[PDB]
Amino acid sequence: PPEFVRREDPFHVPPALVAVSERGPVARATLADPFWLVSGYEEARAVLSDPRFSSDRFQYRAGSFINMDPPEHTRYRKLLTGQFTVRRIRELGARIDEIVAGRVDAMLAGGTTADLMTEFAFPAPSLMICELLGVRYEDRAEFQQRASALLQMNAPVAEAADALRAFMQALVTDKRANPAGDIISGLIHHAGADPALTDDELINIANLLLIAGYDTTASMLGLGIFVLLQRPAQLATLRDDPSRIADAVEELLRYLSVVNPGIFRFAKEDLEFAGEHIPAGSTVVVSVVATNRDARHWPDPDLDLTRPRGPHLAFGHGVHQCLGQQLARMEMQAGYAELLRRLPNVRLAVPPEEVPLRNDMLTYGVHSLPIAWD
Ligand SMILES: CO[C@H]1/C=C/O[C@@]2(C)Oc3c(C)c(O)c4c(O)c(cc(OC(=O)CO)c4c3C2=O)NC(=O)/C(C)=C/C=C/[C@H](C)[C@H](O)[C@@H](C)[C@@H](O)[C@@H](C)[C@H](OC(C)=O)[C@@H]1C
Numbered sequence: 001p002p003e004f005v006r007r008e009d010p011f012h013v014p015p016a017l018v019a020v021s022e023r024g025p026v027a028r029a030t031l032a033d034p035f036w037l038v039s040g041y042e043e044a045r046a047v048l049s050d051p052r053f054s055s056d057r058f059q060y061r062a063g064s065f066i067n068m069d070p071p072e073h074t075r076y077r078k079l080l081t082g083q084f085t086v087r088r089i090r091e092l093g094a095r096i097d098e099i100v101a102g103r104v105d106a107m108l109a110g111g112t113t114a115d116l117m118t119e120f121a122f123p124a125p126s127l128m129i130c131e132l133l134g135v136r137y138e139d140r141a142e143f144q145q146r147a148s149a150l151l152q153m154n155a156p157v158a159e160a161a162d163a164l165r166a167f168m169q170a171l172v173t174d175k176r177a178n179p180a181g182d183i184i185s186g187l188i189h190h191a192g193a194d195p196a197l198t199d200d201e202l203i204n205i206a207n208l209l210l211i212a213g214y215d216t217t218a219s220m221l222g223l224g225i226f227v228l229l230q231r232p233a234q235l236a237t238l239r240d241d242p243s244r245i246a247d248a249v250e251e252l253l254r255y256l257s258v259v260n261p262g263i264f265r266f267a268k269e270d271l272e273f274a275g276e277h278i279p280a281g282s283t284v285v286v287s288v289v290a291t292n293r294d295a296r297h298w299p300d301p302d303l304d305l306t307r308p309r310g311p312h313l314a315f316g317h318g319v320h321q322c323l324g325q326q327l328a329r330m331e332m333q334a335g336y337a338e339l340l341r342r343l344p345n346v347r348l349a350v351p352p353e354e355v356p357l358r359n360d361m362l363t364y365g366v367h368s369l370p371i372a373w374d
């Protein structure tokens with residue numbers, strides 16, 4: 001229902017979500033059939049930690065643990081979390097530091113303008129996923145090609161883009177043959193899997209890591225700059241007080257809420273949660289944007305990079321919180337800092353209302369971002 005998915009601009013919650021949120025923190029709406037929308041922050045964490053609710057749309061390839069419930073979800077997640085070791089995070093963070101520098105090095109070498117999405121926001125997230133999956137330098141062109149084949153937009157799998165699946169097929173075979181330090185190697189060689197992951201499981205996880213971390217991280221990075229460019233006092237705070245970068249990124253996650261139209265749950269059971277009667281199989285969707293703006297939790301919900309960090313729902317809650325949230329944070333922290341610091345007097349190169357937003361996409365963001373500097 002488009003009125004729930006559409007965002008006119010990023011500084012307001014959609015009027016229809018605001019209408020529903022007025023009825024209740026959890027409130028029925030009509031699809032097509034009634035589903036519920038959660039706009040309350042405590043209510044959201046409550047549905048997300050609640051086990052009467054499923055991530056399986058159909059029940060009430062494989063290895064795709066984001067639509068799985070524990071026990072089965074928990075087996076893969078724990079394999080995935082275990083390979084997210086300190087040694088990985090440290091190396092990936094240094095890679096990430098290198099990545100954001102090369103893209104800015106390339107923007108500055110190019111002239112005084114760029115489209116931010118082309119030259120920084122899609123490329124930085126993309127290259128980090130390369131490092132994560134152990135994609136070699138000579139294969140990144142091929143890799144960057146096959147995965148900007150999302151138009152417009154979102155898809156599992158690729159129905160049966162095998163081209164991407166085919167690339168991942170070769171990579172895994174490669175990894176079994178020659179084990180490096182990447183996430184695919186560890187799962188195969190060092191995650192202690194019993195039973196051992198199959199090629200299909202391994203392919204399906206690799207795509208999910210790209211899919212899950214790529215649009216979201218790129219939409220965050222582009223939209224965050226776009227918002228800073230319209231809110232010059234905020235931009236200065238981040239650019240001028242560089243030690244406050246950890247708090248700023250946490251604010252953009254909460255204010256921008258790129259996950260649109262929200263996190264999805266289904267009721268395994270007939271249930272009553274917060275006074276509502278919910279038949280089995282009914283969609284429950286947590287609106288990330290509305291909830292991160294709950295006035296009961298945040299008296300002032302407007303954007304403040306001055307604000308000290310607290311929890312928000314941009315990365316989900318409970319058993320499925322982004323596996324990638326620490327990598328996304330390092331890239332968002334590294335990437336916003338490098339642009340504001342290295343691009344003098346950065347500004348939009350076209351008027352703000354001319355900028356193209358993604359309202360025909362699941363993940364909220366910007367299509368193009370023309371910018372200038374000096
Ligand atoms: C967006 O609608 C999804 C959301 C389902 O619920 C969960 C919590 O699980 C889930 C799963 C298992 C996915 O496999 C998934 C995928 O691939 C994408 C995006 C998801 O949403 C997010 O998590 C945001 O971070 C998501 C899942 C999810 O949230 N990637 C895609 O490329 C994509 C296009 C998903 C949705 C597609 C269509 C909108 C869908 O066909 C429509 C029928 C929707 O109305 C939903 C019913 C949708 O269908 C499914 C099973 O994909 C589903 C509920």
Ligand code: HEM
Binds near residue numbers: 066077216315319321
């Ligand atoms: C700002 C950046 C990001 C945002 C806003 C974001 C948001 C989310 C959210 C809300 C979920 C929960 C969805 C659900 O509960 O159904 C999620 C799950 C996930 N994210 Fe992200 N994410 C980001 C970056 C990344 C990155 C960089 C990765 C890198 C691999 C990634 C991988 C995943 C995975 C694997 C899951 C599934 C976790 C599970 O089901 O166990 N994400 N993300």
